[PDB]
Amino acid sequence: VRINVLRDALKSICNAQRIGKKQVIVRPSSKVIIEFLQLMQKNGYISDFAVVDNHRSNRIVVNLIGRLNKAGVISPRFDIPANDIEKWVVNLLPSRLFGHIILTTSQGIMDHIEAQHRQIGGKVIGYFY
Amino acid sequence: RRALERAETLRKAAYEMAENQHERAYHKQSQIFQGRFLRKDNARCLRFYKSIGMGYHTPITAINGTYIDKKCPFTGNVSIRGRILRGVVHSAKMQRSIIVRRDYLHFVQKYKRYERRHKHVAAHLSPCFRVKEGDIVTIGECRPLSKTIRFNVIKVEPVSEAAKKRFSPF
């Protein structure tokens, strides 16, 4: 059965971008998907997207512009301490200069840079670069 | 009038307990001096009760009941001190005792994951409470009352019928 909606969305996005497509459709919508996409948009990877209402299982449309090279999720939400972020950054990211790691906190969904700025920790959602 | 009715019931019960010749001993409240029961007037109290003191309230059943229990926290001679805990009822077969199930989590660092663990804790249940399996109870710590008992029930919250068993840390 379906479980991780975000994983399916990200796999579809990467698949489409691989063959240089321009638009994608991901079937189930969710708040977490929306925040993930908003962060991606603010960082400049996926431009604009739209949410289509149908009362059940809202669909989404996203517009691509290359740029993105990889995206993923970490299924079991591990609890990163505030001072334990560097190890995950080194393990997961190609370099310590341009990748982004997403965390969910009591202060909301933000990036690892922002969490380091506020010296707080939380749970990990995913990554993109 | 209301007061007069209560004394009659309290006065009356002590006499059936004297007519239950199958019992070997006469059970009485230590605090009360046996002798007030021959006073026709109602100028002396016939039942003893106290307050737990941690914000809990004394049930009406204890105050208006007609039972004797030296291990009850309200009408007896024990004191609540220490830790307060919550759990679910696992078994209720003994005369005035139950087994309480407590659920908690254990973390394993190597795998960065958890395990579910449970423990069984026995407690004394006073006749002022009605309890069936699956109910939620609050237990308070007391002095050693027996080989495996150091807790007394002080609150009961009912649980509905055929409710599915669920892992409930408290």
């Binding site: 149908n54 009362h55 | 509905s160 019928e161 055929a162 409710a163 599915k164």
Partner: protein, 153 residues
């Protein structure tokens, strides 16, 4: 067809986006309620009731006219069956299998099917015992199923 099989079709129904009644609707929310009343008195299951309403009276969806579903209306009117319909039909099918089998007991596929049906019955009955839609004492027994069928029908 997934729980007890290997198939996976997708034949379903797709209701409209808008919840309003038809522009040619000429029925107040009550008029249907009486029609439901008389149909139920004739021992008609709700699914057949919806079929009859849709075909004969041109009502695509009852909820869009009355704001409520058929079984809720029946319960408010005190006419809903004690035993839910899906479970009752499963028990019918089990009884039929058992009868055909006691006529002749060399058929193994029939026993296979009976096993599947009883498993489904147990699962659904457990779910209904939870949610307090059935008495806690309700239990399904193979040898007394026909009796319950007769009384609970």
């Amino acid at each position: 067809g997934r729980m007890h099989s290997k198939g996976k079709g997708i034949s379903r129904s797709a209701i409209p986006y808008t919840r309003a009644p038809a522009p040619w609707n000429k029925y107040t929310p009550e008029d249907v309620c009486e029609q439901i009343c008389k149909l139920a008195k004739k021992g008609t299951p709700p699914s057949r009731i919806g079929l009859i309403l849709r075909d004969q009276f041109a009502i695509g969806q009852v909820k869009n006219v009355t704001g409520s579903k058929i079984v809720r209306i029946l319960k408010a009117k005190g006419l809903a069956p004690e035993i839910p319909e899906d479970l009752y039909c499963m028990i019918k099918k089990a009884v039929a299998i058992r009868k055909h089998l006691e006529r002749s007991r060399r058929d193994k596929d029939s026993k296979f099917r009976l096993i599947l049906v009883e498993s489904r019955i147990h699962r659904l009955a457990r779910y209904y015992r939870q949610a307090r839609r059935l008495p806690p004492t309700f239990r399904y027994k193979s040898d007394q199923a026909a009796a319950l069928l007769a009384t609970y029908a």
